[PDB]
Amino acid sequence: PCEKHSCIAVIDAGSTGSRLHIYSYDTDDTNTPIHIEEIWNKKIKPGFASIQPNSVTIDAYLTMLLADAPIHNIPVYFYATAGMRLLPQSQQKKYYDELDYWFRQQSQWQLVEAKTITGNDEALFDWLAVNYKLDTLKSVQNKSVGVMDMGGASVQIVFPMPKNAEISKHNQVELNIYGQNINLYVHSFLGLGQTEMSHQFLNSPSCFAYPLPDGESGQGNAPSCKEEVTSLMNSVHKVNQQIQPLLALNPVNEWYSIGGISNLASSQLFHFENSELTNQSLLQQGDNQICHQQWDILNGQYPDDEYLYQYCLLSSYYYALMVDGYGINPNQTIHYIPPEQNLDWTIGVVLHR
């Protein structure tokens, strides 16, 4: 198969698990990949950064991830993301040394790289991934496309912006693709992802329908929870100050999101059309459907939904981030990609080595 066409394997080593993707593709007259297709996909648990960094454990792990794969003898890119970013460099190294050692003990995979990518790298790949699926990279874009990734541990935002010397180089990326020259602002906020974020608001009664950990009760009210969360976004990470002045000067024509927001907006408790939403509505539906409901009655109506308990918080969190953080209007359309299309950022690795 990978004799007539190019293939690569990309491993997303995320906090909850590692996901192998194998892609085929051809290459157009600009030396850019086209007709990119995923031909093998496999996830295992737990996350790489949570296991013991010795040869016996990593061999098991990698063997479990790769042993059943039907395509051998291709290049492999090992990219770990937020979960490894929480470890200090010296813990990390222990993992990469064993990894380097495992790959040298065999010849079916050709390791090209193994590293922890930054959130700014991840944000670049998010952008490419989404635009590739929209088919807006080939054409000379008259419309500005912004991408927001609501991840477990970090959140990413990315949008067109011409080079700006007042602003750090780690926040900017120049690339040339399908013969076009592109300049993008990229920012990642480590610690503002929804898993990590949630840990500062578990005993906030505004954010739940609900037995809290301190034994108090839920008494949900979405606008209150928005303000709690907004404290973290803006008093701590200073999202407003870094992002709003840049969007005002470089406005975006269309917003896309990926990550958890796709899963929330397409659940049974929410109703949106055309795979898009607005903030005022998201916040409203959360407030009426979750925040002001009786937990007993709403849990009874959907046992076996293990995420429904958080939908008051996440509603309020998305609104805080997008509206009070990034400064977007509450009535602005935000498109979200549907879970079933399985778009993820790893496809951007294919486009940008």
Interface with Br ion (CB under 5 A): 118-119, 188, 190, 213-214, 285, 288
Annotated binding-site positions? 2, 15-16, 19, 43, 45, 103, 106, 109, 152, 231, 235, 263, 268, 307, 311
Binding residues for Mg(2+): 2, 103, 106, 109, 231, 235, 268
Taking the complex as a whole, how short is the minimal distance between the CB of residue 257 and Br ion, in angstroms?
19
> Which one of residues 214, 241, 274, 340 is an interface residue with a second copy (CB under 8 A)?
214
From the list 55, 73, 235, 268, which residue makes contact with a second copy (rule: CB under 8 A)? 235
Residues 6+ apart with CB under 8 A from 266: 272, 336, 338, 339
Does the protein bind a second copy through residue 136 (CB under 8 A)? no
CB 336 within 8 A of CB 265: yes
**Residues of span 105-124 touching a second copy by CB under 8 A:** 116, 118-120
> How near is the Cβ of 199 to a second copy at its closest, in Å?
5
**152 scored as a contact of a second copy (CB under 8 A):** no
d(CA 147, CA 62): 32
**By CB under 8 A, residue 79 contacts a second copy:** no
Of 104 and 169, nearer to a second copy (C-beta) is: 169
Contact call for residue 156 and a second copy (CB under 8 A): no
Least distance between a second copy and beta carbon 160 (Å): 21
267 binds a second copy (CB under 8 A): no
CB of 95 to a second copy, least distance (A): 14
